[model samples]
Target: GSPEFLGEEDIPREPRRIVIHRGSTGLGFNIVGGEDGEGIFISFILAGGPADLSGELRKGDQILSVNGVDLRNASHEQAAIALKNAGQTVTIIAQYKPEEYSRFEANSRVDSSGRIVTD
Candidate 1:
């Protein structure tokens, strides 16, 4: 397992609540992880999909809750159902930190490889 995912250090640990509205693109994102005592993480956001346009979520943000549904310890299959049935207006509880690598680089991103990016 990755060291960053095993601990709570490196990434910012502040919890953030974000609301996203589903559009014609159908939420425009996917998820990964949700077992082994870990929470679900966002797999990707479609370039012009609702999730991408909202711009509040990002890849690797652990999805702790979705529309009041807890996904912290749910299996991947269970989380998939909960996330897909979240309805039009959804409230996603995730962990995010707005420091350290804000500016990032001209043409590169770290992808939270070393940071836990928690809350």
Candidate 2:
């Protein structure tokens, strides 16, 4: 705990509520989770997508809820469905997980509904 060694630490230790609009590019983010009880985590975010523009969305965020849907026990596909039918408006509550679970995939992309597109 050296005061002179550390520069700055502004990490958010609490969950965040993000309200973002869906542009023609959809949410511009992807999720990776299953029903194993660990909960869903943000896997990816488009460079300039609406979600990326929200200013706080990150790759390792554990999704607490989305559009009023509870994803705590949702399956991988189930979690994927929630974001797709959310229409043009979205409300997501997420907490940043310092763990490495949110490591971005190297070969995944999606143009709509945040689906994992691998080609």
Candidate 3:
């Protein structure tokens, strides 16, 4: 079995800001919970949107908090409400997944020949 994704890197500590444009705070990203609904993660990001424009946020990033609200133990609905009330700009504290688990396969633990390698 694969190791649990939860680690220091996945824990929310660093904060990143995503500004909405034209009165729309919709950063064009889909939010979802982890495998067992332990924490929320960014499932998708729409290109050319505020989220995409930021160049900071990415799919699989775990959202730890919103507007000073600790989402570390929050439910889906709670997170949604905080996001919805964020107005024009949302304060996000998140953590990016490690390179191995990055959205891009090229960043995985593979060798130049494209073979899986422990090192």
Which candidate do you rate higher for lDDT, 1 or 2?
2
- Give candidate 2 misplaced runs (Cα > 4 Å): 1-7, 100-119
- Model 1 compared with the native: what TM-score? 0.67
Instruction: Score every model by TM-score.
Output: 0.67, 0.73, 0.61
Model 1, position 53, has a per-residue lDDT of 87
- Ranked by lDDT, top first: 2, 1, 3
What are the per-model C-alpha RMSD values against the true structure?
10.6, 8.8, 10.0
The local distance difference test score of each candidate is 0.69, 0.73, 0.63
Worst 10 residues of 2 by lDDT: 108-117
Stretches of candidate 1 off by over 4 Å are: 1-12, 23-25, 97-119
Model 3 poorest 10 in a row by lDDT: 110-119
Report RMSD for candidate 1: 10.6
